[PDB]
Design a protein around this motif. Sequence first.
Motif, short mmCIF file in Angstrom:
data_model
loop_
_atom_site.label_atom_id
_atom_site.label_comp_id
_atom_site.label_asym_id
_atom_site.label_seq_id
_atom_site.Cartn_x
_atom_site.Cartn_y
_atom_site.Cartn_z
N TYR A 59 -22.47 -44.32 10.82
CA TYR A 59 -22.45 -45.63 10.37
C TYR A 59 -21.36 -46.53 10.79
N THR A 60 -21.64 -47.63 10.92
CA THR A 60 -20.72 -48.52 11.82
C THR A 60 -20.42 -49.54 11.05
N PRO A 61 -19.12 -49.45 9.67
CA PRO A 61 -19.16 -50.86 9.09
C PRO A 61 -18.90 -51.79 9.60
N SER A 62 -18.27 -52.70 11.24
CA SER A 62 -18.49 -53.15 11.00
C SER A 62 -19.10 -53.75 11.84
N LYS A 63 -20.50 -53.36 11.77
CA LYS A 63 -22.07 -54.03 12.89
C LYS A 63 -22.74 -54.42 11.13
N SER A 64 -22.12 -54.32 9.96
CA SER A 64 -23.12 -53.98 8.59
C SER A 64 -22.05 -55.91 8.14
N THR A 65 -22.99 -56.73 7.60
CA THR A 65 -22.20 -57.82 7.76
C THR A 65 -22.57 -57.70 5.85
N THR A 66 -22.35 -56.87 5.06
CA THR A 66 -22.28 -56.55 3.28
C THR A 66 -21.36 -55.39 3.15
N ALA A 67 -20.86 -54.71 4.58
CA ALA A 67 -19.79 -53.43 4.56
C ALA A 67 -18.76 -54.48 3.68
N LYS A 68 -17.92 -54.12 3.06
CA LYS A 68 -16.52 -54.06 2.72
C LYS A 68 -15.88 -53.16 2.46
N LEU A 69 -14.70 -53.54 3.44
CA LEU A 69 -13.67 -51.61 2.87
C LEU A 69 -13.67 -51.37 1.37
N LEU A 70 -13.43 -50.40 0.50
CA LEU A 70 -12.59 -50.29 -0.31
C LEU A 70 -11.52 -50.00 -0.31
N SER A 71 -10.60 -51.29 -0.67
CA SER A 71 -9.05 -50.95 -0.35
C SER A 71 -7.97 -49.46 -0.37
N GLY A 72 -7.67 -49.01 -0.04
CA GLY A 72 -7.00 -47.91 -0.46
C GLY A 72 -6.99 -46.11 -1.14
N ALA A 73 -9.20 -46.99 -1.18
CA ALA A 73 -9.29 -45.36 -1.42
C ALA A 73 -10.00 -44.17 -0.63
N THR A 74 -9.56 -43.07 -0.64
CA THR A 74 -9.76 -42.28 0.33
C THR A 74 -10.65 -41.15 -0.69
N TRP A 75 -11.35 -40.27 0.41
CA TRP A 75 -12.12 -39.03 -0.13
C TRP A 75 -11.10 -37.65 0.38
N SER A 76 -12.05 -36.61 0.14
CA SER A 76 -12.02 -35.42 0.33
C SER A 76 -13.00 -34.52 -0.52
N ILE A 77 -13.20 -32.87 0.06
CA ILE A 77 -14.17 -32.51 -0.44
C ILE A 77 -13.78 -31.52 0.04
N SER A 78 -14.66 -30.14 -0.44
CA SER A 78 -14.67 -28.90 -0.30
C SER A 78 -16.48 -28.76 -0.86
N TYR A 79 -16.60 -28.17 -0.14
CA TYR A 79 -18.28 -27.18 -0.26
C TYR A 79 -17.85 -26.20 -0.40
N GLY A 80 -19.06 -25.11 -1.93
CA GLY A 80 -19.12 -23.58 -1.91
C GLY A 80 -19.14 -23.02 -0.90
N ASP A 81 -19.33 -23.71 0.67
CA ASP A 81 -20.06 -22.91 1.74
C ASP A 81 -18.64 -22.21 2.52
#
Length: 330
Positions: A59-81
């Motif tokens: 996914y390239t957000p800069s190529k999507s006219t409807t993409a907007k950065l959700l300012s300040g938001a981060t994520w980090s996930i660890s799965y059971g495997d």
Amino acid sequence: STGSATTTPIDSLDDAYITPVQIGTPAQTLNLDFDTGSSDLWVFSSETTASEVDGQTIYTPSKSTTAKLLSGATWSISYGDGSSSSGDVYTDTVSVGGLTVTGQAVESAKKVSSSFTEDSTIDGLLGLAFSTLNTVSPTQQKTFFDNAKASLDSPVFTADLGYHAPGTYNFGFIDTTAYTGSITYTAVSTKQGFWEWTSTGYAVGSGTFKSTSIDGIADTGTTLLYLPATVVSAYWAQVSGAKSSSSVGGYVFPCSATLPSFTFGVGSARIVIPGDYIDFGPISTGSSSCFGGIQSSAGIGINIFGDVALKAAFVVFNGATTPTLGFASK
């Protein structure tokens, strides 16, 4: 509204299933692993560390006219495997099988663990557990289902996974042609954020049914069926030469075996998993030792009704005010 999309096994073992998802404007189609055991929609992206991308569609957000950065938001996930990923967040338009959500949180990976890099067929995950598990900080985000729910004809989605074949995820309706008999509904606890329910027991092959409560989660993002050690031992005891191998990491069996079926209870109803669904093939190329599809949950801390179990059924994830799960034979 409704949506309907085909889901396709990634390989000859049904190790996982991918479903095409349209993101952005113009659409960028990525093949995501729909995961009822987690609650983040994350993708390989133009921001993903280059050395950690190996064949995935990004996914390239800069190529999507409807993409907007959700300012300040981060994520980090660890799965059971033991796998993991992390990054930042955009909102964008996301469609699945004709069902569109605007303003969906699309979590863009900056880093992914080796298991993700090594799987060229999975472009990200689409979480379908409860939004309380979503990892976005400092403002937790909603799942695709949670965002779509109010617009759906009925607040449900269904999983109809195929054995060595494509299947279907539907949103907003129950396809009454997709199962046999009736759907048996059972209570759900959302306390841990999962589609957690209690099976009423099991049988091995043509053996007698054992009535016993087995609490576990309906998890489309887990390949195998993980159950208490007692249950798993009773199953593999019916396969000559089967054994638990600490070196391999679970029960193995001679590839020459014919596996018995495994039945699990849903209320007074019964879902039968054919023996062939429990075969995960040689432990390594050319080996005559095969890996079992029913494994112990001991040390996971939860029982998991993964794809091995779910693909034997038509499964309703009912997201009404009090959620429930439905199972039918098919």
